[PDB]
Coordinates of C-alpha atoms in Angstrom, one line a residue:
X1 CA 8.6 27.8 -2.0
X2 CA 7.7 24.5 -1.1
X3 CA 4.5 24.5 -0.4
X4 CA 4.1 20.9 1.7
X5 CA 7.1 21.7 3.7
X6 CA 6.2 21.4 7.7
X7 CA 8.4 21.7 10.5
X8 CA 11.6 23.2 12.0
X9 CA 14.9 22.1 10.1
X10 CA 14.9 18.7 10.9
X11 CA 17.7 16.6 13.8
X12 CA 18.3 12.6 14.4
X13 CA 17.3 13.8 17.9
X14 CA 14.0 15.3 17.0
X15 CA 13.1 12.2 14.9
X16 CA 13.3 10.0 18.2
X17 CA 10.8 11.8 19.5
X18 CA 7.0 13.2 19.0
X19 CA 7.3 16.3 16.8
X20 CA 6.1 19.6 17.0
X21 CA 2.7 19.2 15.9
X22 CA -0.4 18.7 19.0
X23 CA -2.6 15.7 18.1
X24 CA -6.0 15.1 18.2
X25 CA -7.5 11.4 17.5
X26 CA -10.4 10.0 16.5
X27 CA -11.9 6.2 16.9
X28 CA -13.4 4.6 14.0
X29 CA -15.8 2.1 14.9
X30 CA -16.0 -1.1 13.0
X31 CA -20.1 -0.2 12.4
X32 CA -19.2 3.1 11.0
X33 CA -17.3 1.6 7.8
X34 CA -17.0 -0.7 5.2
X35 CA -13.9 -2.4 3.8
X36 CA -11.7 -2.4 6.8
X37 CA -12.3 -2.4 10.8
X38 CA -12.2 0.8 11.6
X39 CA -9.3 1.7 13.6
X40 CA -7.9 5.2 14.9
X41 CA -6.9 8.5 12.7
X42 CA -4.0 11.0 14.5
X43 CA -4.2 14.3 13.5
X44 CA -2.6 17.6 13.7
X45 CA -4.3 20.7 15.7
X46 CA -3.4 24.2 16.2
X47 CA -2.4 24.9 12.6
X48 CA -3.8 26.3 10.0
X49 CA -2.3 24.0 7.2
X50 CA -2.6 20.3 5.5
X51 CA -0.9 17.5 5.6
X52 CA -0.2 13.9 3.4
X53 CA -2.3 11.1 4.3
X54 CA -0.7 7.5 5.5
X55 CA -3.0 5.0 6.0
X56 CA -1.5 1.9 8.2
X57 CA -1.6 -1.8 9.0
X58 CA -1.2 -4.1 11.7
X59 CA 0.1 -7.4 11.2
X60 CA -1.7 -10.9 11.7
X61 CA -3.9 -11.6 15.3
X62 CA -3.1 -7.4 15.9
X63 CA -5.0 -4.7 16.1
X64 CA -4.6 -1.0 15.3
X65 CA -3.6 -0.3 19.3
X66 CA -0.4 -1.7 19.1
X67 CA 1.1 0.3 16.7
X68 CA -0.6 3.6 18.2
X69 CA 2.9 5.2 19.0
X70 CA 3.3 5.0 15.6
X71 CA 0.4 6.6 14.8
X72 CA 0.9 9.6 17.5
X73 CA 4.6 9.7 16.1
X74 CA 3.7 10.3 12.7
X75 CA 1.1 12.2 13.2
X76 CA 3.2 14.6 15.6
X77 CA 5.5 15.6 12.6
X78 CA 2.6 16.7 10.5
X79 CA 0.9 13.9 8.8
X80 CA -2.9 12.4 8.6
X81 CA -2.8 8.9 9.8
X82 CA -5.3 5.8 10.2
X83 CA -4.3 2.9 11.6
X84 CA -6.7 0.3 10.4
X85 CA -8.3 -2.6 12.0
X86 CA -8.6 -5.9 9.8
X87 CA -12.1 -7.2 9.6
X88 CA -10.7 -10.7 10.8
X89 CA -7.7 -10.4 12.6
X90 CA -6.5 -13.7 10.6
X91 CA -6.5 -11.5 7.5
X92 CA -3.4 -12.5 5.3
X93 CA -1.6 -10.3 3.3
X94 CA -3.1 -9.4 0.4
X95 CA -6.6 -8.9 2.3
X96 CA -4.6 -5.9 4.6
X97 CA -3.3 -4.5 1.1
X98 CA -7.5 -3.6 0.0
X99 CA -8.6 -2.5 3.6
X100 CA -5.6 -0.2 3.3
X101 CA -7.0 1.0 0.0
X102 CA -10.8 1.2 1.9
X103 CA -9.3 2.8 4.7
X104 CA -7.6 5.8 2.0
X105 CA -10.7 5.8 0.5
X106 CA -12.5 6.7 3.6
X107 CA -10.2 8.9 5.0
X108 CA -10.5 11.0 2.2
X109 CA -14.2 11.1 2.1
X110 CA -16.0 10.2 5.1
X111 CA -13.8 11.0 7.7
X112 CA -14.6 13.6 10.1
X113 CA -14.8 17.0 8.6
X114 CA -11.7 18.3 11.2
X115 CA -9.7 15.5 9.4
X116 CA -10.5 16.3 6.2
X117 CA -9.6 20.1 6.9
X118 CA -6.6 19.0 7.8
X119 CA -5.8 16.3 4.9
X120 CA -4.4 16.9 1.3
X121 CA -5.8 13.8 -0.2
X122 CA -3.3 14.1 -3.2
X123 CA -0.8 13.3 -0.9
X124 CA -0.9 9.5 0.3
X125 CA 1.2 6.9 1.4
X126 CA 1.2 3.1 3.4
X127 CA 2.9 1.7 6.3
X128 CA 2.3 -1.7 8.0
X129 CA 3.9 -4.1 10.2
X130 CA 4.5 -8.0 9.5
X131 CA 1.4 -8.9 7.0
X132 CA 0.7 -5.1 7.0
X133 CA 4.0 -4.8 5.4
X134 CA 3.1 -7.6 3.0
X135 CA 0.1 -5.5 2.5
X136 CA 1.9 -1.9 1.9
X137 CA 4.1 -4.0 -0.9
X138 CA 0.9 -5.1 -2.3
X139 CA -1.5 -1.7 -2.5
X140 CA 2.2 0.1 -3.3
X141 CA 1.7 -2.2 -7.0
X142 CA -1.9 -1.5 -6.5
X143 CA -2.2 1.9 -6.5
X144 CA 1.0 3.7 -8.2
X145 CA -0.4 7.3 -7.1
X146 CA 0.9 6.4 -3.2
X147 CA 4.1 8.7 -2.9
X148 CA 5.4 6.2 0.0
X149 CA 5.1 2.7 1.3
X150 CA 7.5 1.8 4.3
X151 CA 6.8 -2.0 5.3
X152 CA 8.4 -2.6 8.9
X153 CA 9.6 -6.6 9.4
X154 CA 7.0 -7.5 6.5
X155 CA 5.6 -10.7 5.8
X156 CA 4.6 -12.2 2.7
X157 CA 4.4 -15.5 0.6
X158 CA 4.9 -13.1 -2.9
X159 CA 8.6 -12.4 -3.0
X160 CA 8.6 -10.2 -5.7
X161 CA 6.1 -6.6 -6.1
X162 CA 6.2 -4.7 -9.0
X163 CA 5.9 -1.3 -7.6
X164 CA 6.8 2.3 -8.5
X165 CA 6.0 3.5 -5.3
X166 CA 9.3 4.7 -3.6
X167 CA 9.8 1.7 -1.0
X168 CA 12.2 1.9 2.4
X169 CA 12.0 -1.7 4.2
X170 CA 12.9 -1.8 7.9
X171 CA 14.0 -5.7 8.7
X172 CA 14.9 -6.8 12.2
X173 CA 18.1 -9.3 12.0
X174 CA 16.7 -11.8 15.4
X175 CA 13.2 -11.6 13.5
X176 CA 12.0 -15.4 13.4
X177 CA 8.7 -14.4 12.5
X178 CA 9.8 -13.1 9.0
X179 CA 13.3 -13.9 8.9
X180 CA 14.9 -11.2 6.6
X181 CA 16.4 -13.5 4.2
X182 CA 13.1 -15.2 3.4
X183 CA 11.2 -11.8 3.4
X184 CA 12.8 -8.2 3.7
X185 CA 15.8 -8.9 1.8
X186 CA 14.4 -10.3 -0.8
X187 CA 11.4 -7.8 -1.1
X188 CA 13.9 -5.0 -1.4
X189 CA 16.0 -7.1 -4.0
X190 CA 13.0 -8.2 -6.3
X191 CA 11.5 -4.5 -6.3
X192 CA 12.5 -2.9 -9.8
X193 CA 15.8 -1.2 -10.3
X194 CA 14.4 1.7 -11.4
X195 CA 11.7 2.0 -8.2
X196 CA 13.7 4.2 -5.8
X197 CA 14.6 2.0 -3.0
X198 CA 16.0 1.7 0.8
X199 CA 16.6 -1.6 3.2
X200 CA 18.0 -0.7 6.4
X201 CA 18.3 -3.4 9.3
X202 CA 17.9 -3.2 12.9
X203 CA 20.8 -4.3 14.7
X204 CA 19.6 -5.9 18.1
X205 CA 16.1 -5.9 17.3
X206 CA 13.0 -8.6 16.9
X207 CA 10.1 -9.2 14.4
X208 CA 8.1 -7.1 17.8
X209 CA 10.4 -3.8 17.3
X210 CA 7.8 -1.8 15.7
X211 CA 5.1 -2.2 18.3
X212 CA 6.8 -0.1 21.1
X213 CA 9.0 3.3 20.3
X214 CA 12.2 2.2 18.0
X215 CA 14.4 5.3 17.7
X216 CA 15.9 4.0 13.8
X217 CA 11.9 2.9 13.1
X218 CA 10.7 6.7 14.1
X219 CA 14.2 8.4 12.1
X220 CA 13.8 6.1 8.6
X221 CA 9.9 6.2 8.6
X222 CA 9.8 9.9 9.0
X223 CA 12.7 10.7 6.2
X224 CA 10.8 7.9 4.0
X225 CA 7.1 9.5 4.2
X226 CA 9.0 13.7 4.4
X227 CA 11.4 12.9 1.7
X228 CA 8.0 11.7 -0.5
X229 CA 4.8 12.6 0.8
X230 CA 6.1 16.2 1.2
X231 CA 9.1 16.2 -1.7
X232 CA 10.9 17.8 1.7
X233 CA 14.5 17.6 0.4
X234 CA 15.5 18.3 4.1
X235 CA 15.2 14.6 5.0
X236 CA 17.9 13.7 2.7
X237 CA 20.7 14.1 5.6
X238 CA 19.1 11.3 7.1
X239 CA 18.6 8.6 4.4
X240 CA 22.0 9.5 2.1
X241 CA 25.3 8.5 3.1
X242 CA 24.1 7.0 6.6
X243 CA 26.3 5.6 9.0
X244 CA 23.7 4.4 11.7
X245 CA 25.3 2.3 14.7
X246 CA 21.7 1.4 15.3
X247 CA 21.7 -0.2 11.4
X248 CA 23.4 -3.8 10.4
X249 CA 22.2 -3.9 6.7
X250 CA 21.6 -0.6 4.5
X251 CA 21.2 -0.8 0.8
X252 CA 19.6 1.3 -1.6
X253 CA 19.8 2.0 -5.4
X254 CA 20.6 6.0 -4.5
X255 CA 17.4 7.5 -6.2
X256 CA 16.5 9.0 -3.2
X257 CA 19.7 11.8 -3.0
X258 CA 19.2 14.2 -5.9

């Protein structure tokens, strides 16, 4: 009965690892598009149904190879993602939110035709680390059709995005790149009441947790992009009266939970 439901009943455990979908990827080059810098799409094989799209950003001097466990991860649970490129790798925040936007557009028209089999373009959503994440809170106001943005130790000048977009914010509490009370906190505060909402804080962890495996990064991203992209009410367990030993800061205006 619902029909964008993928995947065994889901565990903690089987959100700390890659899921139970084979990938296949595919390299954009930065000739073969315009708009963003290419970058790399992860996509599911062996199965005969489709998936959400997520497209995803890097943050400043990075490129999409960094966060390519990501990309495997999420792509391993069933999901379509593209991890872009920035045409200058000194693109600020605000640049990364319309090469995200580019990068959808692409996906969903000039991407490979195995991607496209494999893609419900209905279904999209935005992830990105440091300025990525400034940029996922900026195409999220963009672009209220996204079911998910999930900004990891985000970045930006603009405290305050006007979004509908269901948000969950992962800060780091040793980041001194983004220090959470100059940017995650007060990204999650500013974002409407009505918006539904999560923060949750790494204990232990740097502004560089996202680009190698993170256990709580893999578990919150997952339930964020499931609960939304796929309206899979499964993920709930994870994301609704938490008590995470890996987590120092969780708030959330409970829109999430019924």
């Amino acid at each position: 009965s619902n029909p964008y439901q993928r995947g065994p009943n889901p565990t903690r455990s089987a959100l700390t690892a890659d899921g139970p979908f084979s990938v296949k990827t595919y390299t954009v080059s930065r000739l073969s598009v315009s708009g963003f810098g290419g970058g790399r799409i992860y996509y599911p094989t062996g199965t005969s149904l489709t998936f959400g799209g997520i497209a995803m950003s890097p943050g400043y001097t990075a490129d999409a190879s960094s966060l390519a466990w990501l990309g495997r991860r999420l792509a391993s649970h069933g999901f379509v993602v593209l991890v872009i490129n920035t045409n200058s790798r000194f693109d600020g925040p605000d640049s990364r939110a319309s090469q995200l936007s580019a990068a959808l557009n692409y996906l969903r028209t000039s991407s490979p035709s195995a991607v496209r089999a494999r893609l419900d373009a209905n279904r999209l959503a935005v992830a990105g680390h440091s300025m990525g994440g400034g940029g996922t809170l900026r195409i999220a106001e963009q672009n209220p059709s996204l079911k998910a943005a999930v900004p990891l130790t985000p970045w930006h000048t603009d405290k305050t995005f006007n979004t509908s977009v269901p948000v969950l914010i992962v800060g780091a509490e040793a980041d001194t790149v983004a220090p959470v009370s100059q940017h995650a906190i007060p990204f999650y505060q500013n974002l409407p009441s009505t918006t539904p909402k999560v923060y949750v804080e790494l204990c232990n962890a740097s502004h560089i947790a996202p680009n190698s495996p993170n256990a709580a990064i893999s578990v919150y991203t997952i339930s964020w992009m499931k609960l939304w992209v796929d309206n899979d009410t499964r993920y709930r367990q994870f994301l609704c009266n938490v008590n995470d030993p890996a987590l120092c800061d969780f708030r959330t205006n409970n829109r999430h939970c019924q």
